[PDB]
């Protein structure tokens, strides 16, 4: 019997059929659930994982079973005989970045997962053609305001040569200043990027919103500064649009969430620098960046601007400055025409993609804790979705720090 | 071997040792973690459960090994001859009525465990018995507001005879009625149950807030229709500080979260009937019973009363309402002096809890979609804390209905 999964808003029940085909096992055991936890820490093995992939793609375009499948699949063979790997063709690219996006647990975006661009910048050969190769995905993403998710694909990992690595965790991240008191100026999360930035000849800002450069790492090589060009970089100031006082707090966050130091596997392949990207759902720039006691930490500044009662948890002023805070951005990013989903319509979007996904595929692997929002969890739908966390491939996955 | 467990707003590892104890399976395997899931699914296996709580009790004496451990140990192991089951000691049923709390991974509000009132009703017959140690519970756990947590524990379940059951979800649960427009009047939750006590004798209200009666069944016999005492069941009308018309909106709830369907297991031995009470989390009654779209679903409702923008999802207009709800709900049962406690004091204690029963005994199994409140859930402490989900014996366990 494969996992009965109820949604308890309308008493729905599925069967989750696509977890029985789960490969890379995840840290759960019948002794204790660990789905809390944020990190779970060669020819043949290639091949069935080779093997599997290229029955996903001639599956996905209905031609299982076809000429072209049966010879992919010995021409796959062919080559990790005769090289130990293999070269995914174009389209196989494509629709591997596009599944292991689908198959994020974690994602409540994947409604879109059909829509990426997949800039393949498998011919890259040095950390200056990386950075052109970034700055074309930002460029494109961002789009003025109008974001496009896109991934571009780096060099995949081979034996006898070091790998591409992005070494910022994402192409836009403010400076974090490690202030000699202990305490942090700009974003605590960037403190050790940061340093390393600076340590490779970086000039630092003193601002809270500073823009990090980019460390790129070509292989064999120790990484390459490059700073972003400052229009390429679009940002949003916040206001909010009943505080007027708001837009005091000199608050600002960058339209595009985009991602660089998640692996890519596909087929058994690795790409560790396919930096990718979407668009915020605000939840994650007002509740988790700006009020996280370990992020900008603004709750308590907010709350006392708006005069509430900071004395006492009852009066819920926490909830309140983190609800209005959450409208500013949502208000800013709509006043400065970027893109971005309120966690309510994010939620809603990922219920009708479980949906499409038990007609597609009998399941969708979701990590029910974080497709919950940070705030208002279960004025969301997805609260009330009992959900099936497991790892499918195509995949990203996290990778150690290259330092 | 031993989860490593990491809180992330501070950076603390502990490692959860407890868990190797894991006396039973969870749902989970390596293929895929159903952590989500509500549910997750004699006479000498009676002696192993009953052997090792006489174990974990006397350990927990500091009597380990000793006299009276030798004593009871014979002495379990002549009854089960005998009769095919044993009696506990008032003393190990106070002790296991308060591990089975302890070890409760979603309750939140374990710091309290050991400050429980324990009321032995093993010697009960007839479902008039059972009304009376009822309406004594409720009277002593209410205690005019200030309320105390108590359980009483009903006669174990036993081979040949049936088993007292409080057919009733809780003791103090409101009606829900449908029409000929499909809506349910009242608490969706208690259609089933409104439809049962209307069947076995009990003339419906028409309110939305119309205290149920109590089905209690005695072994083999058919349950019979109990009425509460109005005087017994102390509710708080809902008001806010500020918003004078939500008093008119009527909302009401009860003082008294006393849950009479979960089954209390100590030492193999199985009580179907032990109800158990303590106080309200705010968020349990603004957030989940009042907002919840397949409860009360209000929220619409005081959205348009405080005159917000429902027909956009970014305005936040569910997060506004769901938040001044929660106040209303803090605020009237301050007002009315009746105990509650809202879900930033409740995580702080939890917090406690975490870190006592780390030094206690290694660990604490706790259910992290559980542990985190309804609404803003990282403005909470327990949100960037990692837990691990365990069962221990003594549990609560949830059963199937009486029917
Ligand atoms: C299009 C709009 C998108 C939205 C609104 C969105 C939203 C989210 C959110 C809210 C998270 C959780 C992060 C956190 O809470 O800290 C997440 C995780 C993630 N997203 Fe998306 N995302 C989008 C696009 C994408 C794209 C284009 C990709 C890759 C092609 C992607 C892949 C991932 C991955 C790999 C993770 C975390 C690892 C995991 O899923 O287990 N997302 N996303
Ligand atoms: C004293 C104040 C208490 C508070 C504030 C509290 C809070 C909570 C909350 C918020 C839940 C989650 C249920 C939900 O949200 O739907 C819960 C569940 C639970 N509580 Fe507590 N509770 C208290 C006392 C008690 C007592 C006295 C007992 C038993 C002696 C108990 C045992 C349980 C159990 C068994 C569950 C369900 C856990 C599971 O299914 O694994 N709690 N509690
Ligand atoms: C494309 C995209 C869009 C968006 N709107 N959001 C996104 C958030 C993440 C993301 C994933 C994991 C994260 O956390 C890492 C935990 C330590 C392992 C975080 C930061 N919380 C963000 C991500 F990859 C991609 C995102
Ligand atoms: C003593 C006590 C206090 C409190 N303050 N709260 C409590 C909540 C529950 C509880 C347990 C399981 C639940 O789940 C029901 C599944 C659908 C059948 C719910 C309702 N969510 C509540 C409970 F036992 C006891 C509680
Ligand atoms: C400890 C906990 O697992 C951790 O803080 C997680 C919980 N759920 C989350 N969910 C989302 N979407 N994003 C997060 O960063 C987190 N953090
Ligand atoms: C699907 C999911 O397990 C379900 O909605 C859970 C999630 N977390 C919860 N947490 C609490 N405290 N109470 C609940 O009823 C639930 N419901
Ligand atoms: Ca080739
Ligand atoms: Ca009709
Ligand atoms: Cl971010
Ligand atoms: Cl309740
Ligand atoms: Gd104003
Ligand atoms: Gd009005
Ligand atoms: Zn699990």
């Given at each position: 019997?494969?996992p ?22 995840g ?30 793609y001639?599956?996905?375009?209905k031609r299982?079973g076809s ?13 990790v005989?005769?090289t130990?790997?293999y ?20 994602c ?8 990426l661009?997949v ?10 053609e ?15 305001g109008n ?27 403010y400076?974090?200043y ?52 400052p229009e390429?970089?679009?940002?949003v ?5 009943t505080?007027?006082?708001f837009?005091?707090?000199?608050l ?16 058994g ?8 990207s ?16 370990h992020?900008?930490?603004?709750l308590?500044?907010?709350?006392v ?8 948890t009852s ?17 800013s ?7 971005i ?6 939620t809603?979007?990922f ?24 705030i208002?969890?279960?004025?969301t739908?997805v ?7 497991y ?13």
């Open positions: 019997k494969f009965r999964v109820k949604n308890w808003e309308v008493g729905s029940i599925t069967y989750d059929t696509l977890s029985a085909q789960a490969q890379q096992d840290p759960c055991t019948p002794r204790r659930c660990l789905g809390s936890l944020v990190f779970p820490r060669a020819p043949e093995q290639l091949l069935s994982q080779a093997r599997d992939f290229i029955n996903q001639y599956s996905s375009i299982s000429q072209a499948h049966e010879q992919r699949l010995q021409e796959v063979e062919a080559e005989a005769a130990g790997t070269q995914l063709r174009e389209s196989e690219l494509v629709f591997g970045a596009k599944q292991a996006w689908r198959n994020a647990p974690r409540v975006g994947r409604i879109q997962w059909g829509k661009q800039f393949d910048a498998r011919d890259c050969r040095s950390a200056q990386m950075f052109t190769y970034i700055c074309n995905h930002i460029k494109y993403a961002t789009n003025r974001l496009r998710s896109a991934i571009t694909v780096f060099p995949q990992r081979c034996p006898g040569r070091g790998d591409f690595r992005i070494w910022n965790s994402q192409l836009v991240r400076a974090g490690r202030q000699q008191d202990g305490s942090v100026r700009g974003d605590p999360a960037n403190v050790e990027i940061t340093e390393l930035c600076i340590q490779h000849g970086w000039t630092p800002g003193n601002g809270r919103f500073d823009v990090l450069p980019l460390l790129l790492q070509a292989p064999d090589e120790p990484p390459e500064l490059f700073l972003l060009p390429l970089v679009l940002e100031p916040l206001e909010h649009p505080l007027e006082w837009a005091a707090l000199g600002r966050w960058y339209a595009l969430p985009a991602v660089s130091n998640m692996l890519l596997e596909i087929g392949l690795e790409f560790p620098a396919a930096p990718f979407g668009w915020y759902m605000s939840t994650e720039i007002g509740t988790r960046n700006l009020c996280d006691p992020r900008y930490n603004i308590e500044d907010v709350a601007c708006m005069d509430l009662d900071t004395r006492t009066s819920l002023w926490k909830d309140k400055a983190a609800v209005e805070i959450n409208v500013a951005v949502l208000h990013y709509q006043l400065a025409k970027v893109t989903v309120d966690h309510h319509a994010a809603a979007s219920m009708k993609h479980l949906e499409n996904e038990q007609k597609a595929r009998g399941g969708c692997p979701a990590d029910w804790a974080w497709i919950v929002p940070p208002s969890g279960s004025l739908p609260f009330h979705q009992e959900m099936v966390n790892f499918l491939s195509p995949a990203f996955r996290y990778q150690p720090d290259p330092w």
